[PDB]
Amino acid sequence: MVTIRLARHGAKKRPFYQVVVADSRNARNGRFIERVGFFNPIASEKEEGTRLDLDRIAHWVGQGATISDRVAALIKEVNKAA
Amino acid sequence: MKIINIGVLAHVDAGKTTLTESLLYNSGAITELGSVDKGTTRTDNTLLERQRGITIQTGITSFQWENTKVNIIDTPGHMDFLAEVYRSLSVLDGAILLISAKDGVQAQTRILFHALRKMGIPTIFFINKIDQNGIDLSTVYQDIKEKLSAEIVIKQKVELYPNVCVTNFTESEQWDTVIEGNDDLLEKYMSGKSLEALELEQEESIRFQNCSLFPLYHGSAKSNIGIDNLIEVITNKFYSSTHRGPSELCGNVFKIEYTKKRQRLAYIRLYSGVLHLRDSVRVSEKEKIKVTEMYTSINGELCKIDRAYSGEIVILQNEFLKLNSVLGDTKLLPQRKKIENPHPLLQTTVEPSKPEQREMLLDALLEISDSDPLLRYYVDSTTHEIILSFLGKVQMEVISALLQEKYHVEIEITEPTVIYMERPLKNAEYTIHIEVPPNPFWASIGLSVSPLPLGSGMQYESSVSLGYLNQSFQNAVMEGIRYGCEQGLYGWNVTDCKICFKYGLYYSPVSTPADFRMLAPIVLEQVLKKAGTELLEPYLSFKIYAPQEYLSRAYNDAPKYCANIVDTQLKNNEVILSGEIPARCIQEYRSDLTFFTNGRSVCLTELKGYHVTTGEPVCQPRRPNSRIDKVRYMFNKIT
Amino acid sequence: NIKSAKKRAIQSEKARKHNASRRSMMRTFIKKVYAAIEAGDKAAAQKAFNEMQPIVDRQAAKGLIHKNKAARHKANLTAQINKLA
Amino acid sequence: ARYLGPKLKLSRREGTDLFLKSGVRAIDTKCKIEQAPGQHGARKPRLSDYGVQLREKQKVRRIYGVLERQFRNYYKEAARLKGNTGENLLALLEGRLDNVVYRMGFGATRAEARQLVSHKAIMVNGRVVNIASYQVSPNDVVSIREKAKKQSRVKAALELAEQREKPTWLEVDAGKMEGTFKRKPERSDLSADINEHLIVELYSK
RNA sequence: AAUUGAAGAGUUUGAUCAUGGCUCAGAUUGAACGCUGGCGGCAGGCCUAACACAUGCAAGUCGAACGGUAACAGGAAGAAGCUUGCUUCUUUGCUGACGAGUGGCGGACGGGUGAGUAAUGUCUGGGAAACUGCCUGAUGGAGGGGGAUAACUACUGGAAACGGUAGCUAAUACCGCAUAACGUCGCAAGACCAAAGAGGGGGACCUUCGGGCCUCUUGCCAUCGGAUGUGCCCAGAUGGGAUUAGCUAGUAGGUGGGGUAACGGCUCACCUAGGCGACGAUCCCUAGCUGGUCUGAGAGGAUGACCAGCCACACUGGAACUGAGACACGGUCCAGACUCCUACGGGAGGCAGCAGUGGGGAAUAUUGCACAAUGGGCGCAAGCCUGAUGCAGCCAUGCCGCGUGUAUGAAGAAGGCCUUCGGGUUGUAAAGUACUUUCAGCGGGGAGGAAGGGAGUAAAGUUAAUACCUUUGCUCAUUGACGUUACCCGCAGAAGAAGCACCGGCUAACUCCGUGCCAGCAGCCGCGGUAAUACGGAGGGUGCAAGCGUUAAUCGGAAUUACUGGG
């Protein structure tokens, strides 16, 4: 089952999640079809927040992929009308 | 909570350690074989122990009675390597020596019994083998008073016969003289009148803490009469365990053995506190050393435990463990100790068999140092001849038996290095020549050794006048003369040196400071040839103590001994005399006091006095010397 | 090895008996068709093929067959019985 | 890290002036300069071709105090930079925070300016910085915190800067201890005495 | 804007010029050893024995699949005490839920190892004869019956492990039948093939009062798809040796049958007599592949340990089942070795899972905390499980940053060393004096990683329904292993924190004393048979810094393996 999920990287005590499409059987740091955006929770308010390429994600929703609840919240945080 | 460890001073092969195996049946079962005659389990532990008829080292087993713990270990009284049993006194303040029924307590046990006084902990005699003929039911028990040298009295006594009464006593009317010494009990004696014996048990409880007298006991364990009810007194008579748990934990190592299935386990009692399993602790090395595993030494079988109680003693594995190492730090206890008063009890060679397999036997000699701490050895000899610090006859059999099982090597040696110190017989002219008659180096000097009084050692002086003496090159002449004192013509070490060098012509353009050093050694082997050789041997004095009644039998050993008579003085029933015999035969003197003394023999000495000299033939030990520069040229000097 | 999930082993043992029993009774119906071809009786071959068609397709729904091997039995075997016809 | 040794003795080893003892006093001349670097400094060196390079590398280091391993990182960082390496290496050493504070007259000798940074006194762009290796950004506004401001020793040290040439690439407010770095210094402005070309040759092999 | 980059010296000889090896200056490692050692951040940490392993744990979960209740918590008929509604307390699956048991899914993923493997492997680019549970799009079906069995009882074998026989009972277990199509087979006619229901709520109607019925959500069955995953085919590329030149007999192809999800000698039957090999077949030695890492101007050389992909392996050897997927790390069956248990009848065991122990070796860790976060498994969900992961503890192993103070300070002292004993040097060094306090020590504040989820409320959908449910706003109560955190403030006091190599040339930096080709140093040349600038010690200096040397592997220098680039 293909799914969109954070890959979790960065320096120790410095989380830097990597939203990416990958089958569930794959490891969190393992093989993935393609990266799409990134999430930086420790970034706080500055020039960078949380890029999110909805265009490629809109294609995988029709491919049957199951967005994770973490990425699903990012779909709301990016909003539509806002 | 806990309980003090029981003693096991079965001196003179009293077999009181075999009576301890009966105590495990009394504390049994609920599931146990109950022991058997001979060997036999009884926590035998290592292989080839019960097959020898006695254990090679003191053991230990778990036990309990009266709703209290009652650890104990035995025997260590065999031989011969009794100093190891002295290390067990630190394992428990208790004592329970088994005096023999034949003429009172054996005299060899009196040495272990007098050593218990130095421990400062209480002990009690026991009537081992009471169910036997010839037993001192009223005569031999008096011999324990003369040997105890105090005022101890049995709490009960009987004579049999099938009967083995013990509680029927004891010490009516006259008994209670130890209470008279108590400051409180002596005041109750002034009041007069009869009183309950339990009232005098409080004052005897104070004197028991000072160990003023051995507690009473009777009945052989084989008869199964009194060997169990007398064990109840060990529970009440023994001092209570110093329970706490307040921390911080502290202790010290007691004994260890290299079990084949171990391979190591340095057991040590907990002097205070408690150590949690799988947790780091302090040590004498000043580094962290967690106990990865630890278990109580149950008599029926080893058993793990998550944490030792306070005051308990149990084996535990470790990567390293120096003997007597603080578990804290640090333990705060003090007592006297000795290895039976003997720095070296007749060293014996043990060269391993095979030109290569003997070398692996040397590593097993490091394994003897992992066993009993009273052990030492070093390859001081140029041949690397073994020189073990172990002594005694039967005690050597355990070290030799251990080689047939724990390892795969063995050796037989006993004579040792001769220790000769040959000296020149008289002074004579000599010279290294001049120019190049001749052989290298061209530098030469005329050595002129002279006789000296025995024990004076080597000597030399710079007779040559400057600058020919050489402010710097002349020192090599002395350093080169020392090379010729490493061995005479017969290979014996140089002694009574007195080489006053004089003439020393030399050519400057080709002369070197090593050239004079080389010609200097030839001056010592040429001038030693005029000496004609003079062999001498050490003759250190060896004082010894023997009983006066046997003292007349010690004068017969004098004619066989090479030593000459010396001054001595009697000391009450004990007697002693100041001998002085050569070290080549001194190692056999120990065998003479073990026989003519009847077990009362004792002696001690130390090397002294290089002078000696004795026949015959003037044999010398080769060889000297090799692996040195220009050594093949000294062969040309012979002809 | 002791495990709480050892039930999968005994159940696979309990399953394989009932599973092979269906695979065994089906193949014996298949070997029976081959006996009709060697006999030369083209008419009895058409009847034995009819007996196995409902049961062999039925196993494929049960997962015993990957519904591709069963088709091969409906393929080459049908090419034999009609060639004799 | 810090050499913490006889700083004034090191000047005689180079024969010029490492300014390790600029002092509230002006010129020293108490240590016998040049003629006696040490016990055997009277000897005239052969001055080997390898010696002129090592003599120049240790000279630039001791003026800044940079350790040899950390100093090699400035050379690798300067090779990737645009333009000639000769200027880029001195610029990043001028980009150190302890050096810019020294240019402001904050502290006397450079060793004082480093420790002044270390005790949370410096606060560049409104953010305190302890590290002396800090890479100052263009148009930074370094200034000491109000609790550490005008603490006696800081006031007399500024008087020495009046005799100093005073860089053109930076300026201090003086009336409130507020410095302000601007453009990166030109090679013509800084130094104009040491041979920076020699340093690159040492790492060229 | 995105590789702007190539250095050399010593040493053959009385001297030189070429040729020609050795050696040094560079960077670097999964390093060790020796000495020293304050702290922080980020990583790495069994490369030797794919050697043997104590103990714990590492994959469980769903009652919204079903019979059940073994415990626990409530309710109820009934009971006993007695302050008769206060308490005592038997029954009771009637509820909240939950062992054992049936059944669905996972266990083929995650995690580890490099033994095996020179091609059955992998990398690179193609190819058709495929498969794919879970996820998802589209169209339909979802009708009606039967028989057993675990659990549970009676009895019984065995020490245990673990059953046996005879009976009772359910399901989304199993099994015929009805029903089917663009599905399967066939040229077509025609033949044949599947299943399961639960949970929430409810007006009328209908209740033998088991419930029907309406509606929402989810599951199930068939087909065509989509994606993902896997298998299969070929070409090229992917180690050493010719002192391995012949190799092969299911061996090459054809034909038919059988076999695989699928092609194929994949395997039997017969026929043909071929196939591969010097552009290196068989054999022999060795090796996990590769993205990369290190070195180098480049070309390349070495390597590929961590990170990541594929593959191989799971005590040894072999075999098969269950299943979409295994011919299988924490499955089954069997041989064998090695351990352990027994009541010796018979069974148990496979740490190359994380820790840990023994052994090996120069040499590498805690039997830690928590599922707070992510991911995976199950569940409608809440939650449970996770030695994955997130951390912590340990080691200077490597990189990086910082401290061990700063300024003043001449009698230019004491001591040490050197001397032409005139003096110089150690040396602004220390003492003195003036300040400062990072980091550690101690005492208070204190981010961020946290999004959700639960309860409640309003509205929009759904619907007979303002109920349920779905979804979006909103309120209250909250979820941190790390963690006595980061960080900040405050307190005392220059207070607790500098070593190591080297000093003949190469190669930055010296004298003196001791030892006299003795003792010893050494990477190359080589020193010491003399106040040795090359030994030992001291003074001084240099190099570098919590590291400094030594040793080893590899590259560069070495254009002394030259393809770029030699004879």
Curated annotation (Swiss-Prot), chain A:
InterPro entries: Ribosomal_bS16 (IPR000307), Ribosomal_bS16_CS (IPR020592), Ribosomal_bS16_dom_sf (IPR023803). One of its GO terms (biological process) is ribosomal small subunit assembly. Disulfide bonds: none annotated. Pfam families: Ribosomal_S16. Transmembrane segments: none annotated. The keyword Ribonucleoprotein applies. Induction: Part of the rpsP-rimM-trmD-rplS operon. It comes from the Bacteria. One of its GO terms (molecular function) is structural constituent of ribosome. Keywords: Endonuclease, Hydrolase, Nuclease, Ribonucleoprotein, Ribosomal protein. PROSITE patterns: RIBOSOMAL_S16. The keyword Hydrolase applies. GO terms for cellular component: cytoplasm; cytosolic small ribosomal subunit; small ribosomal subunit. Part of the 30S ribosomal subunit. In addition to being a ribosomal protein, S16 also has a cation-dependent endonuclease activity. Belongs to the bacterial ribosomal protein bS16 family. This is Small ribosomal subunit protein bS16. The gene is rpsP.
UniProtKB/Swiss-Prot annotation, chain B:
The keyword Protein biosynthesis applies. It holds the Pfam family EFG_C. One of its GO terms (biological process) is translation. Signal peptide: none annotated. Gene3D superfamilies: 3.30.230.10, 3.30.70.240, Elongation Factor G (Translational Gtpase), domain 3 (3.30.70.870), P-loop containing nucleotide triphosphate hydrolases (3.40.50.300), Translation factors (2.40.30.10). The keyword Ligase does not apply. Keywords: Antibiotic resistance, GTP-binding, Nucleotide-binding, Protein biosynthesis, Transposable element. SUPFAM superfamilies: EF-G C-terminal domain-like, P-loop containing nucleoside triphosphate hydrolases, Ribosomal protein S5 domain 2-like, Translation proteins. InterPro entries: EF-G-like_DII, EFG_II, EFG_III/V, EFG_V-like, G_TR_CS, P-loop_NTPase, Ribosomal_Su5_D2-typ_SF, Ribsml_uS5_D2-typ_fold_subgr. GTP binds at residues 10-17, 74-78, 128-131. Disulfide bonds: none annotated. Residues 1-242 form the tr-type G domain. One of its GO terms (molecular function) is GTPase activity. Abolishes the inhibitory effect of tetracyclin on protein synthesis by a non-covalent modification of the ribosomes. Belongs to the TRAFAC class translation factor GTPase superfamily. Classic translation factor GTPase family. TetM/TetO subfamily. This is Tetracycline resistance protein TetM from transposon Tn916. It comes from Enterococcus faecalis (Streptococcus faecalis).
Swiss-Prot record, chain C:
Binds directly to 16S ribosomal RNA. GO terms for biological process: cytoplasmic translation; ribosomal small subunit assembly. Belongs to the bacterial ribosomal protein bS20 family. One of its GO terms (cellular component) is cytosol. It comes from Escherichia coli (strain K12). It comes from the Bacteria. This is Small ribosomal subunit protein bS20. Part of the 30S ribosomal subunit.
UniProtKB/Swiss-Prot annotation, chain D:
Keywords: Antibiotic resistance, Repressor, Ribonucleoprotein, Ribosomal protein, Ribosome biogenesis, RNA-binding, rRNA-binding, Transcription, Transcription antitermination, Transcription regulation, Transcription termination, Translation regulation. GO terms for molecular function: mRNA 5'-UTR binding; mRNA regulatory element binding translation repressor activity; rRNA binding; structural constituent of ribosome. It comes from the Bacteria. One of its GO terms (biological process) is ribosomal small subunit assembly. Pfam families: Ribosomal_S4, S4. The keyword Iron-sulfur does not apply. InterPro entries: Ribosomal_uS4 (IPR022801), Ribosomal_uS4_bac-type (IPR005709), Ribosomal_uS4_CS (IPR018079), Ribosomal_uS4_N (IPR001912), S4_RNA-bd (IPR002942), S4_RNA-bd_sf (IPR036986). Changing Y50D: In rpsD101; suppresses a temperature-sensitive mutant of release factor 1, R137P. Not a ram mutation. HAMAP family: Ribosomal_uS4_B. NCBIfam families: PRK05327.1 (NF003717), rpsD_bact (TIGR01017). Part of the 30S ribosomal subunit. Contacts protein S5. With proteins S3 and S5 encircles the mRNA as it enters the ribosome, which may play a role in mRNA helicase processivity. Some nascent polypeptide chains are able to cross-link to this protein in situ. The rRNA transcription and antitermination complex (rrnTAC) consists of RNAP, NusA, NusB, NusE (rpsJ), NusG, SubB, ribosomal protein S4, DNA and precursor rRNA; S4 is more flexible than other subunits.
